[PDB]
Design a protein around this motif. Sequence first.
Motif, mmCIF file in Angstrom:
data_model
loop_
_atom_site.group_PDB
_atom_site.id
_atom_site.type_symbol
_atom_site.label_atom_id
_atom_site.label_comp_id
_atom_site.label_asym_id
_atom_site.label_seq_id
_atom_site.Cartn_x
_atom_site.Cartn_y
_atom_site.Cartn_z
ATOM 1 N N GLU A 89 -103.244 -92.647 -7.025
ATOM 2 C CA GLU A 89 -104.513 -92.763 -7.734
ATOM 3 C C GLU A 89 -105.276 -94.023 -7.322
ATOM 4 O O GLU A 89 -104.823 -95.137 -7.596
ATOM 5 C CB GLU A 89 -104.270 -92.806 -9.241
ATOM 6 C CG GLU A 89 -103.638 -91.549 -9.811
ATOM 7 C CD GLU A 89 -103.210 -91.710 -11.258
ATOM 8 O OE1 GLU A 89 -103.650 -92.675 -11.927
ATOM 9 O OE2 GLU A 89 -102.424 -90.861 -11.731
ATOM 10 N N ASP A 90 -106.436 -93.838 -6.681
ATOM 11 C CA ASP A 90 -107.379 -94.941 -6.389
ATOM 12 C C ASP A 90 -108.436 -95.122 -7.494
ATOM 13 O O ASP A 90 -109.423 -95.843 -7.303
ATOM 14 C CB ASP A 90 -108.062 -94.729 -5.024
ATOM 15 C CG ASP A 90 -107.232 -95.252 -3.869
ATOM 16 O OD1 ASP A 90 -106.013 -94.976 -3.830
ATOM 17 O OD2 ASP A 90 -107.806 -95.943 -3.001
ATOM 18 N N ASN A 91 -108.200 -94.505 -8.654
ATOM 19 C CA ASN A 91 -109.144 -94.506 -9.762
ATOM 20 C C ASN A 91 -108.676 -95.642 -10.653
ATOM 21 O O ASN A 91 -107.627 -95.541 -11.294
ATOM 22 C CB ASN A 91 -109.152 -93.171 -10.534
ATOM 23 C CG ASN A 91 -108.705 -91.980 -9.692
ATOM 24 O OD1 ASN A 91 -107.780 -92.082 -8.879
ATOM 25 N ND2 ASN A 91 -109.341 -90.838 -9.910
ATOM 26 N N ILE A 92 -109.445 -96.725 -10.675
ATOM 27 C CA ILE A 92 -108.987 -97.982 -11.274
ATOM 28 C C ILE A 92 -108.838 -97.825 -12.796
ATOM 29 O O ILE A 92 -107.924 -98.396 -13.397
ATOM 30 C CB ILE A 92 -109.921 -99.172 -10.922
ATOM 31 C CG1 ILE A 92 -110.059 -99.346 -9.397
ATOM 32 C CG2 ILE A 92 -109.391 -100.470 -11.528
ATOM 33 C CD1 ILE A 92 -111.346 -100.028 -8.971
ATOM 34 N N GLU A 93 -109.723 -97.034 -13.403
ATOM 35 C CA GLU A 93 -109.647 -96.751 -14.831
ATOM 36 C C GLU A 93 -108.474 -95.828 -15.157
ATOM 37 O O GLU A 93 -107.730 -96.095 -16.101
ATOM 38 C CB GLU A 93 -110.967 -96.142 -15.323
ATOM 39 C CG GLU A 93 -111.081 -95.964 -16.835
ATOM 40 C CD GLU A 93 -110.911 -97.251 -17.632
ATOM 41 O OE1 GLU A 93 -110.352 -97.173 -18.747
ATOM 42 O OE2 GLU A 93 -111.329 -98.332 -17.157
ATOM 43 N N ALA A 94 -108.301 -94.766 -14.366
ATOM 44 C CA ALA A 94 -107.281 -93.734 -14.646
ATOM 45 C C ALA A 94 -105.829 -94.202 -14.456
ATOM 46 O O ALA A 94 -104.912 -93.626 -15.050
ATOM 47 C CB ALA A 94 -107.539 -92.477 -13.823
ATOM 48 N N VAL A 95 -105.625 -95.223 -13.624
ATOM 49 C CA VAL A 95 -104.326 -95.900 -13.527
ATOM 50 C C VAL A 95 -104.106 -96.754 -14.786
ATOM 51 O O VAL A 95 -102.987 -96.823 -15.307
ATOM 52 C CB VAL A 95 -104.218 -96.748 -12.237
ATOM 53 C CG1 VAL A 95 -102.926 -97.555 -12.212
ATOM 54 C CG2 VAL A 95 -104.285 -95.847 -11.008
ATOM 55 N N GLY A 96 -105.176 -97.393 -15.264
ATOM 56 C CA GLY A 96 -105.163 -98.144 -16.524
ATOM 57 C C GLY A 96 -104.976 -97.306 -17.781
ATOM 58 O O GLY A 96 -104.411 -97.784 -18.769
ATOM 59 N N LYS A 97 -105.466 -96.068 -17.760
ATOM 60 C CA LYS A 97 -105.204 -95.119 -18.843
ATOM 61 C C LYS A 97 -103.720 -94.759 -18.862
ATOM 62 O O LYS A 97 -103.091 -94.778 -19.921
ATOM 63 C CB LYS A 97 -106.070 -93.862 -18.695
ATOM 64 C CG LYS A 97 -105.832 -92.812 -19.771
ATOM 65 C CD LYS A 97 -106.981 -91.824 -19.872
ATOM 66 C CE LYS A 97 -106.591 -90.590 -20.666
ATOM 67 N NZ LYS A 97 -107.705 -89.609 -20.727
ATOM 68 N N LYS A 98 -103.174 -94.444 -17.687
ATOM 69 C CA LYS A 98 -101.739 -94.146 -17.530
ATOM 70 C C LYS A 98 -100.823 -95.279 -17.991
ATOM 71 O O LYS A 98 -99.709 -95.029 -18.462
ATOM 72 C CB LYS A 98 -101.407 -93.778 -16.075
ATOM 73 C CG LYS A 98 -101.570 -92.300 -15.765
ATOM 74 C CD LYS A 98 -100.377 -91.493 -16.265
ATOM 75 C CE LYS A 98 -100.684 -90.005 -16.328
ATOM 76 N NZ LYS A 98 -100.934 -89.419 -14.983
#
Lengths: 240, 1053
Positions: free
Chosen positions: A83-92
């Motif tokens: 995941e290169d999605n900075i928000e979606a790694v933070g959600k995880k």
Amino acid sequence: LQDAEWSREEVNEKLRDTADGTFLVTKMHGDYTLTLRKNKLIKIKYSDPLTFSSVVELINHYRNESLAQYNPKLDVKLLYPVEDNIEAVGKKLHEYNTQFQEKSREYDRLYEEYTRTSQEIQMKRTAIEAFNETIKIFEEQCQTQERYSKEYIEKFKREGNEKEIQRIMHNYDKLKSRISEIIDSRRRLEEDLKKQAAEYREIDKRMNSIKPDLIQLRKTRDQYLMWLTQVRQKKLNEWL
Amino acid sequence: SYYHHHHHHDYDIPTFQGAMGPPRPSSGELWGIHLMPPRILVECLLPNGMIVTLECLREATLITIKHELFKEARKYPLHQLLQDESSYIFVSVTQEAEREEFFDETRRLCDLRLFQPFLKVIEPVGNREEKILNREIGFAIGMPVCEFDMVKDPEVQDFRRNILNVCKEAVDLRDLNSPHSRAMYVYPPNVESSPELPKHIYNKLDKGQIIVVIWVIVSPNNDKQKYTLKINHDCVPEQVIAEAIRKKTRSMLLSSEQLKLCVLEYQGKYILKVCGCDEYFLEKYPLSQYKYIRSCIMLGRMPNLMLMAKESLYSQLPMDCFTMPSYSNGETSTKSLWVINSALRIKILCATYVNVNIRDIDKIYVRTGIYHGGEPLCDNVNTQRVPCSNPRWNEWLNYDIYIPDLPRAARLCLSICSVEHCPLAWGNINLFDYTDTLVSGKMALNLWPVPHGLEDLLNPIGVTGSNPNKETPCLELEFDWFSSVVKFPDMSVIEEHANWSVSREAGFSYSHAGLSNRLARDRENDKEQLKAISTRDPLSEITEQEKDFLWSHRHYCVTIPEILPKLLLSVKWNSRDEVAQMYCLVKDWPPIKPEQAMELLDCNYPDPMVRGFAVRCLEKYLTDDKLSQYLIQLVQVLKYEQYLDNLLVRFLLKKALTNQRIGHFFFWHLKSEMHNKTVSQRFGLLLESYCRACGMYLKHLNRQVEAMEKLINLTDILKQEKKDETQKVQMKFLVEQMRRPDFMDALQGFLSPLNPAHQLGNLRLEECRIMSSAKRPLWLNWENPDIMSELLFQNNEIIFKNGDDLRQDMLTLQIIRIMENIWQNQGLDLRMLPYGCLSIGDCVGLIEVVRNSHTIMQIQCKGGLKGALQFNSHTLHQWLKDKNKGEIYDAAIDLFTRSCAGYCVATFILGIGDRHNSNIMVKDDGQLFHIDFGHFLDHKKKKFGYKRERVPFVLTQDFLIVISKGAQECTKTREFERFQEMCYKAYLAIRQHANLFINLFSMMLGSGMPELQSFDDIAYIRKTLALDKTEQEALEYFMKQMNDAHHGGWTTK
Ligand SMILES: O=c1[nH]c(=O)c2nccnc2[nH]1
Ligand SMILES: Cc1cccc(N)n1
Ligand SMILES: Cc1cccc(N)n1
């Protein structure tokens, strides 16, 4: 050299629970510090054999070779360079961190049940000893009277024979049926002792199944939180 | 659309202790029931074989019962076969499972701890009745003394007999200058460490004078008489006793000379007491140096002492009357360890009781390693064989280390594990026994489970020995046999091999002398690099360069005694050559400051020679003041000792028997942990010795012990049957129960465990009550029965809280108490109120009530306008003015501003629980202090954490306004410029003593406190103090840290 990947405290929390060989790398004191876990810290042309022109040059040589020839008792290589999605790694992160915290309380709850059950069990065992000793005294008492009671018969007999010996037999009957109640009362504990001992094992069991999940759930959450911090220090707490 | 209609099918509200948020349980007055029924039937077994069954009252004394039994025995058959009641004693099976003979017939049926309610009659066997008052000892300890007599272990039985050495020595010191030294034991002088006075205390004296008030009693003993001296602060008690008598006995019928004669005779018959508590001034110290005076200076109070006849004091003391107990080698010149020519190999055999899901786990094995705190060889495992099901490896594990290279204090640390690496159980064994004998044969090691914080693979910090808990993983194993008991070298032998290794060291080639661990220098720059190392804290871990660098220079390291901790950790303990040399340094190394020497009793220094030197340091430097300050840590540190009998145990036991104020807290700290099986054995045996030797205090402790047990039982019922009852219902049960005669007996005439100086007399039950908290603490209140109650406090009151683990608070309060003394004795007055706290069991304890203090919430509730809109930022300030008016206001704000600064720093440093309006407290005089600290070293960083470096006390408007004397834009005053400068001077002061605070926390790892599981827990306090940085950076770091939590304020020095 800066992208080679290389304070004391956070180095140990990344060297925590790694294998035998894993590593990483006041200025008026020294320059760079190799932290090999066998935690062995090694200072860093870059002691006597200085001909290694870089911080990346000096570390590659000891990836192949051990550290026994340099300083006698360090027969261990630099084997594990951990995941290169900075928000979606933070959600995880929040998701796994909720799952970690949620999994921890189940582990912490059980540790108390284990420890109570240890105490409650041994409290039962001591009571059993007590019951056994209690009985021994009543078994000794039903004995003690048989000496003095049936001696009294032979002293006289005729003198209030069934008038006396009924009230001696009545006592003797109350003495023995009370023993019957205690023995019944002891057994009823021992059966619960094994029901406790059973539950006790089941807590142990479930702890040991929850543990490896707990560690891997934690270990993922670290590397997820590492990948993010490759700044945004203060946004982490809302997720976390 | 709130939840996308996603059902949780598992969930069901019927059937957690999250709802109404404890620790338990125990059986009380009879088996399986907390309090015995008020009228109860008790089966009395007579010697004639008859069971007569009396209905007794719960509260009835054994005299009362015996008297009635033998009245009721006349009605039953075979009466002619009974003796007189006088020729009999009671006996029964107790809750501890022993058959205790009941000698003290004034005892009540409920207080006997009876298991099943029955009583056997017997003629008192074992004609020395005196000797069977070990129940006293067993009651004090919590387990019966007979439970040691049937223990097989020689160590345990040798500890019991050997340690009597110490007990005899201390009782000899007591009856040395009797009756004086007997009073000196009981009532030792409560005395600040330094006579030297801090400047700010001095300036409350006008050039060093105090106004005292000596009191006297004459006829019959009702009326008293003030004699208001005005004496120099550093004059001694005997001088103060003279001047009081001088004024007492001046007259118009006594000439100048006649007075001096009448002074000299009268003078020496009296000694100085403190009015209102049992403290005394029994030796040549400056008056200022006694704690009571120095408080009376700081609080702006006039000391109230009392003149007391020595024969009325030596009346009240008893005889110490010690008695030696009823409990009153080597095969050959056995094969010395240094002969044994082999590697190490240990045979793993089989685990039995392993509890694992076969569905979850694939495979399980035994991990192994040798240790000395840190490890002397490459760690290994056995292969992943017979996984789950039956676990059975018949392997010899092979450790690359020669058997001569094992240090005296070597230890095997093993752990069964799962694969995916993950521990199941763990256990550690000492490779030598207490008689120096290398372990050979077959051991049956029962294992411990992995704790919360330790996720690590093996656990070497964990306790040595088997688990007492039977039904747990029992991993048995076998050690190598060498046709002889293999014993560890004498010191006579180690010395020679050292003198050889050094004399050998002198003759190698210089070609070879460049192996980076041998010195020929005999440089100016190096000697500066060494003392640089010396100054660094315990947790700044040393490098391999620095280690070898130190180890090579070791002989120059004698110049800097304080380096030793760093040097010792630099020795390779797997090299007997090195170790034998180190042994010879430590033999005559310059003794050191206890604050530094206490590091050497932590878990990273488990060698006996090292720990001996550390005890040697305490024998010299550590004073009876400084000992009781650090006692907690020293009682904790016993856990890291290999054997029961050792130098530290003998040091502390003696001090405890030499000083009855140490003795007291020494008892309760041990007795506290007696629930914990890791230390039940050790601390029981130790507490047996103390209780056997401590004199008449055993009877004083038994009364405290009996009182604490009454309150445990009472709360236990409140927390279980009387939950889901209104306070009104609960209190009416608490009041009902405390009026019973057994409670009135048990809870009235005794000494505060919080401070045995204060007595506790009758119970005022109208002030006794349960607090709101759902833990159900008791607010208990006692009449202070001193002659001079009124001069100190008429009422004494302390809080008993069954339910919370006090020992975190206990330690944070300790840590504060130390920070205060550090600040203050280094001339700068911040005023912390480390209230008293004592853990006396498993989440059971006592908290001192500070009177006239209130939660900020109350301040705002009381002074909060009606028609609930918002509380005012000023209503603290308005409430505090309403108390302090005049020049009194100006000095009240100084107190708030001096306490509030110190409590900011300690809190920020220690990382304690978030402060908010219900755990901050302000007193009428205007001092601020924190309560209920929760978790200390940032332990809610286990959930996330990572460079949080929290500010827990954040000065809201409320506090700012009061600091700035009511202004607006408080941020920008001098009042606050001062405050800031206090916080900076406080912070920097602690930072130069940060070795101590690390060290204290290091020694606490022994206690099973979730917040201190391992050294990196402690490491928080490095970041917080910025010890890696230079102090100006530390200062700006602190500013930065305090500025961001406040949003503006802190940027100039
Ligand atoms: O070999 C031992 N057996 C034990 O039962 C024991 N218990 C406590 C401490 N060490 C011990 N050592
Ligand atoms: C007969 C016996 C043996 C051992 C302990 C006890 N209490 N009783
Ligand atoms: C993590 C670690 C390793 C070795 C020694 C110490 N004291 N600590």
